């Protein structure tokens, strides 16, 4: 089997991407944030504290003839940005872009933190990291990908995120019309539960490539590109007026600037992030100070190849017995 679903930016800045997901019988369609940095499929629901729901579409398990309470199961998750959610668990039928999993753990939110409430466009998350990170207790649950794996034509999914435009998540096949040149594959460590790999280095604009190992994760659920402070300083030094602002919480730059590109290495290959991808607009409405799309990972404890990086490539998440990552230009 295969599946193919369009993923759409939630706003003009590509702050995140939502993908429609069918849950239950008859189908209830919710727009979920596909997150290769976590491993829980959770949704706003009829159980979510009413004051914490503000415009989201909810899953109502009592209206699904295929929903079953997973007795005794609870979940609770905290994300890198400090957001969180928790609740109980159902199993139900879940379909993505024509690909159907029966008995998928659907984690029903009883509580969500303010950042989730305040984002009316995201109805929940669909985790695509390794199932070892799944938070369901006392019986850990499998991701949608993990559950679908055996049935897929090939045990892979691909992320093709757009810049200021829709893109595609495919399951079970590689669309050879979706990228240019060849796909370069690189090793993955699953030891932290992430799609963790090592970039071979970087360049700033038309500058010479610096060969240096950068360990990090491929994370579709993170907006920006988070890299070591040395690398990030080297980038923003090429932007007149750019500075790191403690008060804003990162590098800012004059909105009148033309940003240079940023290249990262995948083995011997090179992915080029155009300068415009690194512009996340005024820090506050009407400001002439703009927020940068490349930020320091210092104090995160890991480097994160988030959407800013991933949207510059066609990315293969290879879930073979030894997982790997593939990157192509597009």
Explain what the structure shows.
Keywords: Aspartyl protease, Disulfide bond, Hydrolase, Protease, Signal, Zymogen. Its EC number is 3.4.23.22. The structure is a monomer. The protein has 330 residues and is mostly beta strands. The chain has 2 domains: 5-174, Acid Proteases (Cathepsin D, subunit A, domain 1, Beta Barrel); 175-330, Cathepsin D, subunit A, domain 1, CATH 2.40.70. Helices cover 6% and strands 44% of the residues. It has 4 helices and 24 strands. The strands form 3 sheets. A 7-stranded mixed beta sheet has the order 18-17-12-13-22-14-21. The radius of gyration is 20 Å and the shape is globular. It starts with a strand and ends with a strand.
Chart the SSEs and their pairings.
Elements: E1 3-9, E2 17-23, E3 28-35, E4 41-43, E5 68-78, E6 84-96, E7 99-112, H1 114-117, E8 124-127, H2 144-148, E9 156-160, E10 167-171, E11 184-187, E12 196-204, E13 210-218, E14 225-227, H3 229-236, E15 243-245, E16 250-254, E17 262-266, E18 269-273, E19 279-282, E20 289-292, E21 294-296, E22 303-305, H4 307-310, E23 314-318, E24 324-328
Parallel strand pairs: 3-8, 4-7, 13-22, 14-21
Antiparallel strand pairs: 1-2, 1-10, 2-3, 2-6, 4-8, 5-6, 6-7, 9-10, 9-23, 11-24, 12-13, 12-17, 14-22, 15-16, 16-20, 17-18, 19-20, 23-24
Looking at this protein, list some descriptive labels:
Cathepsin D, subunit A, domain 1; seven-stranded mixed beta sheet; six-stranded mixed barrel; 44% strand; globular
């Amino acid at each position: 089997s295969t599946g193919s679903a369009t993923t759409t930016p939630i706003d003009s800045l590509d702050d995140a991407y939502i993908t429609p997901v069918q849950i239950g019988t008859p189908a209830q369609t919710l727009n979920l944030d596909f997150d290769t940095g976590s491993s829980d499929l959770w949704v706003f629901s009829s159980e979510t504290t009413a004051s914490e729901v503000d415009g989201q579409t909810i899953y109502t398990p009592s209206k699904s003839t295929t929903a079953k309470l997973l007795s005794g199961a609870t979940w609770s998750i905290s994300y890198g940005d400090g957001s969180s959610s928790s609740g109980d668990v159902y199993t139900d039928t879940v379909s993505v872009g024509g690909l159907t999993v029966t008995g998928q753990a659907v984690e029903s939110a009883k509580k969500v933190s303010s950042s989730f409430t305040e984002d009316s466009t995201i109805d929940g998350l669909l985790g695509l990291a390794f199932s070892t990170l799944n938070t369901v207790s006392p019986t850990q649950q499998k991701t949608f990908f993990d559950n679908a794996k055996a049935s897929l034509d090939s045990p892979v999914f691909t992320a093709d995120l757009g810049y200021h435009a829709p893109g595609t998540y495919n399951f079970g096949f590689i669309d050879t019309t979706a990228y240019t040149g060849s796909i370069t594959y690189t090793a993955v460590s699953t030891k932290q539960g992430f799609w963790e790999w090592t970039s071979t280095g970087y360049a700033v604009g038309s500058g010479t490539f610096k060969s240096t190992s950068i360990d990090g994760i491929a994370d579709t659920g993170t907006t920006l590109l988070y890299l070591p402070a040395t690398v990030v300083s080297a980038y923003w030094a090429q932007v007149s007026g750019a500075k790191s602002s403690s008060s804003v919480g990162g590098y800012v730059f004059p909105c009148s600037a033309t940003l240079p590109s940023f290249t990262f290495g995948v083995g011997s290959a090179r992915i080029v992030i155009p300068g415009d991808y690194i512009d996340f607009g005024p820090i506050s409405t009407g400001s002439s100070s703009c927020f940068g799309g490349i930020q320091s990972s210092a104090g995160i404890g890991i480097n994160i190849f988030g959407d800013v990086a991933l949207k510059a490539a066609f990315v293969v998440f290879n879930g073979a017995t030894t997982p790997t990552l593939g990157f192509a230009s597009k």
